[PDB]
From a paper:
However, while three A9-Fab molecules formed a compact cluster around the 3-fold axes, the Fabs of D6 were comparatively more outspread. Among these, the VP3 BC loop and VP1 C terminus are in close proximity to the “canyon” and have been implicated in SCARB2 binding. Furthermore, D6 seemed more effective at blocking receptor attachment than A9.
Enterovirus 71 (EV71), a nonenveloped single-strand RNA virus belonging to the Picornaviridae family, is a major causative agent of hand-foot-and-mouth disease and herpangina in children in the Asia-Pacific region. EV71 virions have icosahedral symmetry and a diameter of approximately 30 nm, comprising 60 copies of the four protein subunits VP1 to VP4 (5). Here, we report two new antibodies, A9 and D6, that potently neutralize EV71.
Author numbering:
A (entry chain A), B (entry chain A): 73 to 210, 218 to 297
C (entry chain B): 82 to 318
D (entry chain C), E (entry chain C): 1 to 239
F (entry chain C): 1 to 49
G (entry chain D): 1 to 106
Amino acid sequence: HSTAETTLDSFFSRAGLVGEIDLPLKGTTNPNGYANWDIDITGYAQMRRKVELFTYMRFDAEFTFVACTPTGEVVPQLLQYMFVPPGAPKPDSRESLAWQTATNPSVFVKLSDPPAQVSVPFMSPASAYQWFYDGYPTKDLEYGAMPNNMMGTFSVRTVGTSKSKYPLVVRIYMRMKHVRAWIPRPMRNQNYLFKANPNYAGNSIKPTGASRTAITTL
Amino acid sequence: HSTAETTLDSFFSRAGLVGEIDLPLKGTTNPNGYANWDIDITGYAQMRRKVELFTYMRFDAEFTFVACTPTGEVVPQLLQYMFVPPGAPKPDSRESLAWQTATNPSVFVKLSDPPAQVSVPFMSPASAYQWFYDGYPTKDLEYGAMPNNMMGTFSVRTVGTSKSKYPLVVRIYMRMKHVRAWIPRPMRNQNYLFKANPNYAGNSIKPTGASRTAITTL
Amino acid sequence: VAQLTIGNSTITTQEAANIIVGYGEWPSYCSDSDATAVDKPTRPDVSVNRFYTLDTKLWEKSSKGWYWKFPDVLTETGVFGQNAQFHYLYRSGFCIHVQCNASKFHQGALLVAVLPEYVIGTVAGGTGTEDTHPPYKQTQPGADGFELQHPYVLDAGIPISQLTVCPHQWINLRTNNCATIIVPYINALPFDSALNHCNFGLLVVPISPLDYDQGATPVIPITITLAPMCSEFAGLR
Amino acid sequence: GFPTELKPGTNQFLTTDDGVSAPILPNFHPTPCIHIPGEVRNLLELCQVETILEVNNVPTNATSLMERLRFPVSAQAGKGELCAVFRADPGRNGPWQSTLLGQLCGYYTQWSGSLEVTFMFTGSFMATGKMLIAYTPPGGPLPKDRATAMLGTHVIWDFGLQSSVTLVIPWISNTHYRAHARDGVFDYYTTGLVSIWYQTNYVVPIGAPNTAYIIALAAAQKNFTMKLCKDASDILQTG
Amino acid sequence: GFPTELKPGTNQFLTTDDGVSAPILPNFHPTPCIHIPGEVRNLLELCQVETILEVNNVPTNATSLMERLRFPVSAQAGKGELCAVFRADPGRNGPWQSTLLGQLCGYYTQWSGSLEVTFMFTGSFMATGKMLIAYTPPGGPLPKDRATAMLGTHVIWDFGLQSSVTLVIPWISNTHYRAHARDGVFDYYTTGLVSIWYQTNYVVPIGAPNTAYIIALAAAQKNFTMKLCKDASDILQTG
Amino acid sequence: GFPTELKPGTNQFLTTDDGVSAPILPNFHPTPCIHIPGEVRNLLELCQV
Amino acid sequence: DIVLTQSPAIMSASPGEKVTMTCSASSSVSYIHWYQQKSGTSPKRWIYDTSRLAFGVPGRFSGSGSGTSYSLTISSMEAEDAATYYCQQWSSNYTFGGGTNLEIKR
């Protein structure tokens, strides 16, 4: 008789994995013992299609950080997680002064210390994050670009003047909370090709669902 | 004058050992540094006969996890315990995406951190777990199979991309709480042969209890 | 002594011996706020609910005991077996009546009890290493019933010495001959399948063996008459 | 200080624990929510919306995909002939996948409620005739012929009188669990069936096309429900 | 923050600590409990139920196991002869193991209350006679003969008049501790005794069997109790 | 959670600290104390003998 | 038509060592019992239901077996035990074994 599970909040709860940073010792990948991750909630595959059910949305995100070595090991290493709000400058190097700009919230924690966890508010200067924008910002490549949907960047790095002694891997989970949505719309039935637009494969246009032989046979 | 101890809850409390996972380094046993344990409350030997005193039952289970190396040693290794509800897909490999499916509650903890502990609800879609089912699900091998008695699976594994550096052993205890039972029935007097049915040994049919010489001698 | 009637069925029975209302509950119906409040479940009153008198079994000195399954026993029999089969769901209570006809010169004692979810367990090969599952003739014997082969453990690894823990009644030839039992619908669900699940099984075993001197009738007819109470059905096919 | 003993589960990270965490920007006052039309609050709102049911889910040829939306009736079909058939399986493959209901059932494990299909005749206004639409509850096998289906829960539809008709499916329940291959799937079995037969033939005057199509629209009643969030999809965000 | 000092026992796992733990599925609403007949709430309900006491616990031959349930009386037995005997030891081996009471005593360490045995004559209706049933409290040795037992707490039973009779055992207490071998067992000593003698012989008219059996049924009064859960069993779940 | 700072003496074992500890047998109801003659309550009772 | 074969027929122990006599059956059996017979005297009772000892019997005697092969074990052996030991079955036709002449070694 109850329908608590079919609510928006119920549907979008759960902290999913949306990011993974690699900080190897020897490597082509993030060679300066640091990394910048612009917040992308599409990071959880399944996500995109779920949110793209609505035209507008609003919510808060709870971020939880999981860090270890590639084998999932724990070591005595301290870390800095920096959140650079949109409009704030991300660090270009492992010594950029951005790391010390008070206006960039930062949180420190040892790998041993349990997961780091913080809540981030509804940033957008607009009244709601909008997944679809039918226009351009005052044939073009700026089509469908609602920038005021930026949540910010997360800069991660080993604390200290020198490179870390261990190879590290950070995982970022994100639980969406206090959700409100407007204007529902057709469930994506075609495969996604790009993170930006809704473009699809005009050759590989598949029928929404399983087909059959005749309309008289089951 | 008090009879608190003879209550159902009193009878079924206590967290008993119902599971033990082995995660050796070199071995035939669980070679992929992970394991799947479908929840079996018969895991505690003594259990089966106690519950089989009633026809129907209902309850919640409190699970407590105890992990160490074979000699009972503690080491700096992180672990993931995943609970896959019934109907959810168990991980076929050490990299199955199931490990990351938000809808599969997971809990992380270091071996150093004290025991992990969580409560699991009355799953069954039926009004009660029923130990006996006199029929088949819509001579057969589906006799006495009330599937809607599944509690779920517990998937365990070392965190990280690589195998753990240590040989590990997890023990699962389970305290039953908030118990209700119906329709009491004859106490099993014959030895159990299979985990599924009540079949017994038709040759080795023993008298419920100790025999004597004459009915006139004590 | 007097005779009661339910339609076209008229049984001659004793005034009103002690009846056993299993678990203190009376076979009642199921209200409107349930699982299927749409498919309003039709409740048979007319012919469907009356006195069925099963093929009398003959008690012998060597008899081991008998058992029937429910609702299986009737899904074959008459207009009730009609509903049970061509209907999707079923819930029904039962009035069971068991009687023997013996001279004051016979002796015996039959325990007659009802056991929910009576799950048969065969011998398993003998030595204990064969996972043989009881046949269909053993799991649902019909209206002829079936004979126990290991009464002591009730063909299922349970002492019979403890069967009294179930709705039971005794039939000691030197005191009574008829035993009666009222059974409510017992299951983990409001409704269920009438052909796949046997909510319970009627058990009748000789605890004290039949006996008599040469010359007296050697077999005591046991007559089971039973009637459905507040029986309901849903989803015709 | 104040005496305390830490209990198991201390320091653990539950991906479903909905506790509170520290606000990264304590002073920030997020731009106020203003009024926006059509806010959705509970998915079951969506489930009660009529979506086109691709009953005719047979053509796959890219340019004939629009054909799945409508099936047809014609003069050529003789009285009694079976026009079309399908099951009442919202979550399983087939026709229901096209409906919004179907797609939402996919993010859930269990469900139950009464459904409701509406048929729309889009033929010429001059056409007339009767179609028999019958529902065979779960278990009952597709009726042999029109007459046997005529004895079941049916509806005679005269599109000469009313261009629309709505059928209600009393009940469907995806509750019976199944562990086939080695992958456990909480499946139907309640595959209720909806058959449609030409009660009479398609009648038309000179000047009107001898074929017309029909559109199936489905939704669930207000008594619908779903349980067990289960994210599953073939479409995902590409690298 | 708030000042605290952790006390010993911090971080320990007590298999009997009944604290609370975090719910794995916070949103899950488990299927509602509906009414089911005969719910049990406290085991002592079961202990008050009459179960068949296998007094005749002598045959072991597989096909004669049903014989343990009933012992017999016959013409051959002369007046005064001792029919049968047994102790009032619910938890110890022997006869009581068959009763449900007995089996439940096994999951407990201590207990005490008044018991109650009922005898049922299942012989021919034409038979008559008298049986003397005597109880010798704990310590008192089995009475030498019928007459000496006649002086103790006894009951003359005429199964010519009443087919049943119930005896009450005033009291039994498994409280006296014993550390024999090297394994400590809280044993009886209160082995109350119940003897049964042929007060008169078995009398019958031509045409009636010269043997009849009797059934023992036992249970405990409402003043029964048990203490110390102790799981113990020979039957366990096999590998 | 609730903010706290542990103060010195944390984790120490004072042989004279009369705090409380967890009951090993929570369900156990110890046999009731009955009346026994001549109970002593304070040693100074003895000193006056 | 159920036969019991006992091995060996004659035995000699040191004494102070163990002794293992065997009773094998042609078909599966429920339990086995053992008797003793010294010379000039009748058979005495020894072991019943396979492993239970008669009141008199020393604790140094043992009994086990399951199915079709059962055995009486003595540890340790003493000069007072030398007798013939028979097994017996109670399932169908009450059959005795051939016995085992136990003797003192010197």
